[PDB]
Amino acid sequence: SGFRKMAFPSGKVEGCMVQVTCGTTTLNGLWLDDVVYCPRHVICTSEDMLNPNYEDLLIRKSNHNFLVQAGNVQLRVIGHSMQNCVLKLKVDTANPKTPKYKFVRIQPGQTFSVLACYNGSPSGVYQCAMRPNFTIKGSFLNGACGSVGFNIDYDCVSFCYMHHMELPTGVHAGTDLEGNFYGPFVDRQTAQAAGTDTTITVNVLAWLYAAVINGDRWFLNRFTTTLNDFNLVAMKYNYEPLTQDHVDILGPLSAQTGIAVLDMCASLKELLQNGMNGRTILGSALLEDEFTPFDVVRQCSG
Amino acid sequence: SGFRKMAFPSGKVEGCMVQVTCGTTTLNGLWLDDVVYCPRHVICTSEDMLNPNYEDLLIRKSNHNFLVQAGNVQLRVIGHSMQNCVLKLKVDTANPKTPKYKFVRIQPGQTFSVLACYNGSPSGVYQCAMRPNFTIKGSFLNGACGSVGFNIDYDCVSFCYMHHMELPTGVHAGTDLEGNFYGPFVDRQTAQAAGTDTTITVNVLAWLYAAVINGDRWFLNRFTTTLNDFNLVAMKYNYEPLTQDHVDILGPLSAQTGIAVLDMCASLKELLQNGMNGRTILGSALLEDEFTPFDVVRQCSG
């Protein structure tokens, strides 16, 4: 027992991280088979980033203008392509450490592990949620661009995120591995609004189930509620509306705990209206929303 | 910018995890060179764990009674030794994936990454502190014993922890890689007192420096204090006493922020006496003590 924010083991992704240099600019690429994927802003100077014409900038770049290093292994670039906001560099050598992998575009509220990298070298791993407003609350210093987010399923690495930018608010924005931004963000150093970031209600409920499984039961109250009554409270507190799809996803945890999802919603309601009165749940003094129902079952079934 | 609990990249340790079976019992071993290290309680039945005579139990075990599997690779055991609370199984094959490594016994308040494993297979990675009372607040289901904690320094993996047990209180106890328990714990299913768990003051201060670096400055107040005045408050709140050694360790963060360590102590004091008034620091509603000064500089210098 116990409950921790837990990343996937990062080894399969560590083997894929390379350094991409184009003139002045160095960031991280992901080397799968004979293709290296990196942020297209690798072709920009600090100046270009104010208002880049990526098509025009890229036209002044040939294959030999892209230096790719996998540790000391220099890779040879034989082709380049812009796909949305990512560059695809065709290299002469298939990565021998290529894991079984897929590219997935994840839904807001889903979680994933980030391997934070600098100069093609891993520094650390943490768990992140795609916020409802399509930002992540990450940890990225200059040079982290090209660092990736992923899930693992037995042998298969599902890449879902590539880091591209920090908003002036200090939250993070990036793309899927087809180079399509999550959210309304662009790869340009302008002012960008994220919008209201709401709490992921189905995740808070999963984490309450986690807390019950671990003996933290103080917040369980005498009430129940309705989906409509609970959503009146969710809207007031900037929580995502709960749907019968969400209730269905919580079924296995309801079944394990013998606590009905609407009984748990009534507990959450009293928590939202009354606060925590200075107590804690699984060592937190606030309601945690970056664990999915899958995350809770993972860490409660191994 | 941003601030996250960040584990070391786990790949170097993933390559070392094997499955150790002895009759009925399966747990995780660590395969370095031609030696596999595991908890000696691998030789126990659930019944034995009530009051084991490890020397007597081990005597009824030969080399061929220990099955070691590294994925499907079956290893051949050619020698066994009990060292304190760990078994050392000499195998015929040096692990080709052996990283540069050291065994280190860490001090209370130091941090490390845990790779949680089942049947010799990695499931996840998280950051842990050795609590002042020599327990860790981990996440471990049945079969996790033999999972290891480590730090990385460039190329070198310093193993500092092997998981052995869960106390009836749900916190975790284990050994260094010489098989010496942290704290007063034994590898026996009896009642065990952890003792008072105090807050790691030097870590809370590091995290306050982290918060300032990231723009969360609201808790900075008009006061300063003395080491003796602050420690009067630390004792009242079950905080570890702050020493000039701790002040020296915080020097680089003082230097970066231009905030004197005793000015930060005076802020911490007002936080302890007044609470957080329902605000947050780096997204937490309580004072965090599982980041070392090194951890903060790592995540603020890359």
From Swiss-Prot, chains A, B:
Instruction: Give start and end of each Peptidase C30 domain.
Output: 1-302
The annotated modulation of its activity is: Inhibited by pyridone-containing alpha-ketoamides compounds 13a and 13b. In turn, alpha-ketoamide 13b (tert-butyl (1-((S)-1-(((S)-4-(benzylamino)-3,4-dioxo-1-((S)-2-oxopyrrolidin-3-yl)butan-2-yl)amino)-3-cyclopropyl-1-oxopropan-2-yl)-2-oxo-1,2-dihydropyridin-3-yl)carbamate) inhibits SARS-CoV-2 replication in human lung cells. Inhibited ex vivo by michael acceptor inhibitor N3. Inhibited ex vivo by compound 11a and 11b.
**Which regions of this chain are Cytoplasmic-facing, per the record's topological domains?**
1-302
Active-site residues (renumbered): H41, C145
Catalytic reaction(s) noted: TSAVLQ-|-SGFRK-NH2 and SGVTFQ-|-GKFKK the two peptides corresponding to the two self-cleavage sites of the SARS 3C-like proteinase are the two most reactive peptide substrates. The enzyme exhibits a strong preference for substrates containing Gln at P1 position and Leu at P2 position
List localization entries: Host cytoplasm; Host Golgi apparatus; Host nucleus
**Coiled-coil intervals, chain numbering:** none
Q: Where can the Glycyl lysine isopeptide (Lys-Gly) (interchain with G-Cter in ubiquitin) cross-link be found?
A: K5, K90
Determine the domain of life of the protein's source.
Viruses
Summary of the function given for this chain in its UniProt record: Cleaves the C-terminus of replicase polyprotein at 11 sites. Recognizes substrates containing the core sequence [ILMVF]-Q-|-[SGACN]. Cleaves and inactivates human TRMT1, preventing tRNA guanine(26)-dimethylation of tRNAs. May cleave human NLRP1 in lung epithelial cells, thereby activating the NLRP1 inflammasome pathway. May cleave human GSDMD, triggering alternative GSDME-mediated epithelial cell death upon activation of the NLRP1 inflammasome, which may enhance the release interleukins 1B, 6, 16 and 18. Also able to bind an ADP-ribose-1''-phosphate (ADRP).
Subunit composition and interactions: 3CL-PRO exists as monomer and homodimer. Only the homodimer shows catalytic activity. Interacts with host FBXO22; this interaction promotes the proteasomal degradation of nsp5.
Its name, as the record gives it, is: 3C-like proteinase nsp5
The organism of origin for this protein: Severe acute respiratory syndrome coronavirus 2
Q: Fragment boundaries within the full protein?
A: 3264 to 3565 of 4405
